[PDB]
Structure formats: structure tokens, C-alpha cells
Amino acid sequence: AMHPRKDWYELTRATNWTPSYVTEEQLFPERMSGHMGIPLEKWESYDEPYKTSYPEYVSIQREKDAGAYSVKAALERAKIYENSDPGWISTLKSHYGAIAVGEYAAVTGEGRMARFSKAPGNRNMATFGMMDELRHGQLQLFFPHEYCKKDRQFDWAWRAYHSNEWAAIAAKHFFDDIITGRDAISVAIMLTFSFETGFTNMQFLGLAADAAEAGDYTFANLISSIQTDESRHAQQGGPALQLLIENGKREEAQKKVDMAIWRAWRLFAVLTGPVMDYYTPLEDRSQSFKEFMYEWIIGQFERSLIDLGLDKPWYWDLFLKDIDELHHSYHMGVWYWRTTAWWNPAAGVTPEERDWLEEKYPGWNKRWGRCWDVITENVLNDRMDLVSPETLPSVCNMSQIPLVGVPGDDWNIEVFSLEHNGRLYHFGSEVDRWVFQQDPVQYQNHMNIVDRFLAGQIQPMTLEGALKYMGFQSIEEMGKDAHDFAWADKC
Template identity: 40%
Template sequence: MPLRDEWCDLARKLDWSFSYAEERQVFPEALSGSPWLPAQEWRDWDEPFRSTYAEYVSTQQRKEVSFQAIAEAVGRIEDVSKLDPGWLSVVKLHMATLPLAEFAAVIGNLRAARFGRDSAWRMTSLLGALDELRHTQLPLRAMHDLVRWDEQFEWTHRLFHSDDWVAVAGRHLVDELLLGSDAIEFAIGTHFVFETGFTNLQFIGLTAMAKQVGDRLFEQMLQSIQTDEARHAQIGHPVLKKLVQKDPARAQRLVDKWFWRSFRFFAVVTGFAMDYLTPLHARRASFKEFVEEWVVDQFQSSLSELGLALPKYWQAFLEALPIYHHMLYASAYTYRATTWFDFVLPGPKERAWLAEKYPQTWPELEPVWHNIEERWRAAGPGVEWFTHGTTPVAFCNLCQLVLCAGTPCRNSAVFVDKPGRRYVFCSEPCRELFEAEPERYAAHRGVVERILAGQAPANLLELVRYFGLSEASWGRDVVSGHYDFLKRGGQP
């Protein structure tokens, strides 16, 4: 047996008995997670990578050198400024929503590195925490030099420090999943559902698109991050497997909840990118096709293998998949000054592609884009406000995203009255998740509650400033309406 294999587990799989404290004190249920099981129940915990710290450092060092070389070669302003403007919005959206969320994941992983119930789990979580620190630093470093060229890149760091509605929604998800979860919920929600279930959309789908548009920096960054994620995401499966044996109802509940919440997140971050912001020639497949290939199939087989049912909101997810992100994008396009990235108006060719990819739902969305297009035509290029809303929008009290669920003909918002407060939810799954754990969510104040309490302005322009945006940073149409297809007699 090679020396490495002989010695690896001596350090990696090293648990001991406590003589001066009870096991329950060392691993309190509130932090280690429910159900609380004695150490011997976790003794067979393992994951396939079995990295040592020395191997980890050596591998990461090589990856860092490689990424640094790419960043120096193709990450300068003169390189990035040549990229398609729609694609640059993909970069701005992606880079702002992920790095500081990754930093929260450092904390989640460190909690598991202390309170996970097996030493190998704790060791892998420690490496996971180092991974997530790296995933925070890479984008911050790569985007930093671009700020002097385009102020919107500053939002790579700024978003989660702001009260922008996307930040409010992002924090609501991230605070609960990464900062507020015990080690078991973190492992299932983050590693099994979010990372194993969904991040292939980014790492495979968006990487392919980055390659097509010639953004080598983004492509290499995602690939470099993906190899880390593939390792630490393995924590989820053995934790879920144990939970299925000991408390299958809780296992199912956690999968149900985090599947729905993760889908909402990716519908924005990846849905916008794949179906609208990426130029048509670089799209390999639609968001729906990617989800069907990389989430639906994989999730079904993983759950079946573990003896779990499909997530409770599976049907609602399948119904939302071909429409939810379209509703949200059209809404956000007409409130683009409330974000830090620019939006693409889909023209006739893009809409023909979307109609082909979404034959059941696009007919209800086409009139919305036709209306926006006609208003651009009436106002002329440069007149952003004529295709921009001025009335405050409504947000879901669970996901904190705009009430965009359902269809244009039937918005699925639901209302619930509790003593002293009315709550509104974009959909039944969001309502159910809220009502299952009201103590977690009831006190949160979203954008509308802040406006009604006088903490945020109701006037949209003032609200945009409250979000932390300025004229130099707020979102616009990528070409301010200068599309050939909008010109009288212009080519489609």
C-alpha cells in the first residue's frame, strides 16, 4: 500500500472520546444539526476525494498560478472592453451576486469544520472554507481593475453591502442558507441541493457560452472554481444519506425547501444570462434546456438512489421553468435603473429563438416585448424613461423577488393575514415555506415594508438612490435603444 494511503486517514479520520465534556456539549444540536446522533452513528461518513491538506495546497497553488497567467494575459480593460455589451452584463450580474455569497459560504463551511459530526466531514469542510475564500477573492481581484473603466464593476463588492432589491433577496437566501443553518442543513441545502444540483448550470452552461463569446477570463475562472466545488459538494451526499436513514421526513423537508429556493436564485442569475444577455450566436441551449439536462435528470436520479421522493414543489418548478425568468426579466428590463447592470432588448431574431424554445409560454410574453419595442420606437433612442416603470413594485415575503410568478394572464400572488401584518407571496411554494417556519421569516422587512414604514422612499428615483445606485452605475438598455430593428424600415 502506498505510504499516502497508509497514513491519510490517520490524520483525516481522527475522532476521539471526550473525558471532560459531554458529546452533546461539544456538538450542540443547535449548531451540529438535527437529528442529534451519537458519534458512532457518523463513523462510516466518507467522501470520495479524501484530500490531504498538503495535496490541497499543492493543487490550489497550481490553479492560482494558471489563473493568474490568464488574468494577466486577457483580463485587462482593453481585452474586456472588446466583449459583447450584453455579455458584459452577464459578467456584472454573476460577479456581483456570487463573491460575497461565497464569503458567507466560508462561514457556513467553517461552522461545519467545527460542528460537523465526523472528523473527515470536518476536514473536507475546512478545505471547503478555503475554497470559498478563494471564490470570493478571484472575482474581486479580477474585476477590481475594471472599476476605473466602468463603475458598474464596483458592484462586484458593493452589491451585498447595499439595500438594492437584488441584495435584499440575495441576503435573505444567503443569510439563511450559509450563515444561519446548522451543519446538517448547510450540508444538504448548500452542498447537495445548491452546489450538486444547480451549479452545473454555471460551470457547464455558462462556461460554454463564455468560450463562445471569447471571454477567456470568465471561462477560466468558472473552470477553476468548478474543480473546487466538485470536491466540497461531495459533503452533501453522505450527510443526506445518514439523514434519510434516521429522519427521512426532515431529509425530505430540507430538500423540498432548498430546491425551491435555489431554483428561484438561478432563474435570475442564470436565466437572464442564458436567454437574454448572452448574444444569440453564443447560446448553446436555452435556460430551460440546460435545467432539464443538468438539474432535472441528475436530481431525479440522485434522489431516487437515496430513496427520497422528488421535491414537494417539483410540479410547481416544472410549471415555472418555462416562464418565471421571462416574467422577471421583462419586469426588470422596465425597472433596469434599479440594478447595476444593463439589459438587452430582445429583437425579432432573439424573440423568434425564444418562441421556438418556449412554444407554450412565449405567446403570452410576446405582446409585452412588442409593447416595449413600440414605446422605444415612439420615444426614439436614448429616451430610457419611456420604457421604464415609475411605480414601486411588489415583492414576495419569502424569496424577496418581484411578484412575477404565474403568467401575464394570471399572476399567482397569494396573500396571508397574520395578527398585525399582511404577507404576500409570489407563489404557493413560497407561502408554504414561510408558514412552515414563520419564526425564521416573519420579522423580515422587505423593500415594500421599508417604504411603508418610512425607512425607504416611495419615489422611484429616490428609491434607486436608496439602493445605492447613481447615474453612473444604474442599469440602462445596453445600447440605449439604438437597435437597427427599431429604425423605421430597419433590418430585423
């Protein structure tokens, strides 16, 4: 006979002890552990709600992978690359580039907890977490690898995080802030709770819905399998938060959640927003970006956050306004400066699409539509020089994404600036400035790409110079309109 896990599980996490040969603080240094002075004994209350054990883990993960790879193998000849809308192909390129090596970085966040968390259950669940993120990094390198021979842009599944391309810098600045750059408890709160229970569902399940509509089952099956692991290891954050609250650290906990959610939001707005509302073919848009946000972030995540005893973020109303507006401007920017992306942005403004956008975002045509009108006119008149930039966008010193606002009939744009230690910083929102002010030592000497350009670090100081600095190794790699402006034939 075998004894049920419930009977022996406690012994697997009975691993705290009282140090005698070094001090508790030497063993768990605050800068790495983030225990906020809460003594070892209090951490033994930590109780992970989504448990597993080693023999169950290897058996189940074996099954998960067999499925993912079997489906990929069975569909190699489904002509996805050849027959898919180019906007869908760009969605794949964007995803793998933005995600693959970041998953591998998350191994480090999990490792930080496995070594430095004072909670024994956390250290064990973080060990499975290390393994999960290893899986995710390896899957998301293996899957796009077969397309290298088709398209140099797929090289960026591996190359992106090794580059200074603007979006890769935005990704690294975020992940290095919430995953690899902070103590174990900060990781538990910012990565496992805020990012992994909050936002990743948008990219790994929301996008899976669009993938299924688009007929890309290899991809939909892959990312939904990945999320099954996320759903387990993300459950490390809640018990940490509850423990902090019980131990008089609610204010500190709340601030970390608020910071992480906002930082994640700005990144998802530039990555997932354009994909869901513009790149994905209209027929395959299961819901709009905003609709998915209301499902996943408001309906599910925010409700869970309240249930655990935290408060809605201070910036709630600003966040709601942003969901209506931000990604439309981010999309416009990514497309106008497409040559700096490693994917081919689709404009997504054919009349049929503009009607959809108007339905999903009343007033769209009188705002972003005004700029797209000018662009469309230029395209129809073959004035192609007017659809490519001759200067740099101004960039947020927090998110590393350009500073945008609402264009058109009710134009409104605001930059939030800050003098600090003899330097002038610029932020794309009140919250981004607030994030900086929460922890200036984390950020103060970081230089964004525009800062570097102005300081003489990018030579020559030209578009070509910047493109080389960003790591583009050939002309084919630079982004172009997904459809080579064929969409104009609809206008």
C-alpha cells in the first residue's frame, strides 16, 4: 500500500531550524530574503494552497509535455506559416521574442525564493517553480526554432533579450525589476501574485482563444499548457501576502502589489493590446483587448485581490481610463516606428476593422482615426516617406515605452517629469513617476534608449545607427507593415 500525501506532506516542509553557527540574518539577509524583520517562527504558518510532491510532479509534467510536443509534431504540415494572415505570424514572433528568455529569467526569481524565503513551504513550491519556468523557457525556444529556416525574425525568440532593441529593454527593465532584481518576498508578491495571477492570463489564455479562432492549435495548445503550471506556482504569492498582513506589514505589501500591477499593465498594453485589437485578423478576435481585461484583470484578478484582504490600487480610476486608451496609441507608435520592431506590425485599420474598433471603443474614429486618416491618405497617394519616422519618440524613464496621449478631436497628452539628483526624468503616467519615487536606488542611474542617444552612446546618431545599436543584423529582420500595405486596397 501507499500512504496518502496528506499524511506525510507536513514532513516535506518541516525544514526550518534555528541557526547556531551563523546568525539568522546572515543565513537570510534582508536584501535577498525581504523578510521585513519577521522572525523565522512566524513564517512556518505559510501554507501553500496548491500543493504537489516530487513523484506526482515528474509524472504529471511528463504527461503535459508529451501532449504539447505530440500536437506540434502532428500539425507541422498544417501550413500555418504559409497560410496564416501575416498579422498572426507577427503575433507569434512578438510573443516568442518577448517571452521565451524572460521565462528562463523567471527561473531566477523562483530560485531566489527557493534559497532565501523563510517559509519552508515557499522554498519547496519555488523549487517546482524553478522547474516550471525551465520548462516554459525551453518550450518557447523549441517551438519557434523550426521557423528560423523560414524567417530571420524568428531568431529573436532567442536574440531579443540579448539586444538593446527598445521593446526588449522595456521587457528586461520590467522583469529585472519584478523577477531578478529584488528579494524573495518581493518576488513572491510582484511576480507570483501580481504578474502571474494577474496579467499572464491575458497573454497565455486570452491570446490562446484568438489562436484557436485563427486555427493555430499548436500555439493555443502550447500556451494553455504552460498556463496550467503558472496556475500552480503563482499560488505562492497569496499566502505570503496573508502572512505579511497578519504580521503588521499590510502597507508594505499593498505598495508592492500596486507597483507590480502598474508596471505589468504598461508592458501588456504595448505587447498584448496591439495583438488583440489589430494584429489578430478581425474574424479571429474572440473579444477585444478591453473585454479580455475586464474578464481577466477586473472580474477575476481584482476580485481575488479583494478577497485576500488587500485594497483596490490607489490608481484604479486612472487604470480604467488607460484600458480605454493606451494600447491604441501604443499600437500606432509601434506601427509608425515598425522598422525598430523584430515583428511586422499590422496596421489593422481597414474600414471593416475601423467599424469594429468604433463598436468596441466608441469615439475611436474621432481620436486615433484622425491620425490613421492622414496615414491612409499618404498610403493611397504613394507618399511613403510620410509613413516612416525621421526622429525618435520620447521614452518613459520607467516603462521604457514612448510617451503617448489621446490624439484627434479631444487631444490630451501629459508627461510627468521629475528632477532627481541633478537629472531630469520623464514618465508616461503619474503612477510610473510614483513607482520611481518608491525606490529611486533601483532606477536612478538607469538610462533609457533616448538618454543613451543624447549622451553619445549610440553612434552614429541616426536611424541606421540606432537600428544597429538595437541589434538588427540584417535588413530582413527590421519590421515592416504586415501586409505590405495591401490593406490600402480596402480603403
